[PDB]
Amino acid sequence: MQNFGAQEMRKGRLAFVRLSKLETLQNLIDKMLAERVFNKGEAADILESNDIRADIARALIDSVTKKGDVACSLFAGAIARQDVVLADAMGISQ
Amino acid sequence: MQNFGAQEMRKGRLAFVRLSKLETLQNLIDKMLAERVFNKGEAADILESNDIRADIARALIDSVTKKGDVACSLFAGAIARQDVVLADAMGISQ
Prior knowledge:
- The structure is a homodimer.
- By secondary structure, the first copy, chain A, is an all-alpha fold.
- In chain A, about 75% of the residues lie in helices and about 0% in strands.
- The first copy, chain A, contains 7 helices and no strands.
């Protein structure tokens, strides 16, 4: 441990949100599962960010589609090379 | 090369939003940058509007803070062991 309470964690919040790397966040969450601070449901919730994920997907595919057929065709080739199942669900050749 | 234009891309839109993994999405953004489909400004619009990392960080530190001082102290201990810059910025000594 360290002697560092909730008052001190509130004062450190902005730095933590700004500066923490994603790899650090995943390890911290695993460490709080190992210490029994989190149960699996809580860790799952913290990790889940499907709404932002889907919003990234909308922005990406909408930016591609606006550029027309040649961009869409490059995009579809790249999807096939990245995830075969997603390509197949979309109608893309593999 | 595929011939997979905008029409087909719109018909696969809902599958792409629901089924894409986050790592796929980040890879595709890099690929579309590589292919000169995007300029650096476009690839950053997509990502900077939708920071999953910041979302995970806020949910994490707020779960810990609400559990009180022991949990906060364990959390601070693990931060110090992970990232010395984060630890220094938040007031944690190491």
